[PDB]
Amino acid sequence: XXNXXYX
Amino acid sequence: XXNXXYX
Ligand SMILES: *[C@@H]1O[C@H](CO)[C@@H](O)[C@H](O)[C@H]1O[C@H]1C[C@](C)(N)[C@H](O)[C@H](C)O1
Ligand SMILES: *[C@@H]1O[C@H](CO)[C@@H](O)[C@H](O)[C@H]1O[C@H]1C[C@](C)(N)[C@H](O)[C@H](C)O1
Ligand SMILES: [Cl-]
Ligand SMILES: [Cl-]
Secondary structure, eight states: OOOOBOO | OOSOBOO
């Protein structure tokens, strides 16, 4: 993970 | 804004 979003 | 991140 480590990313974010939101999609 | 309203979206997220983190870049
Ligand atoms: C997403 O990251 C930001 C930055 O550190 C935090 O402020 C935010 O609380 C965090 O969102 C939580 C709540 C959410 C969106 N329901 C998810 O569970 C995420 C992974 O964590
Ligand atoms: C979104 O990220 C910023 C920067 O780290 C935080 O300061 C902020 O608290 C965070 O927003 C929260 C609250 C919100 C907007 N209701 C959402 O739940 C997000 C994911 O987390
Ligand atoms: Cl949320
Ligand atoms: Cl908002």
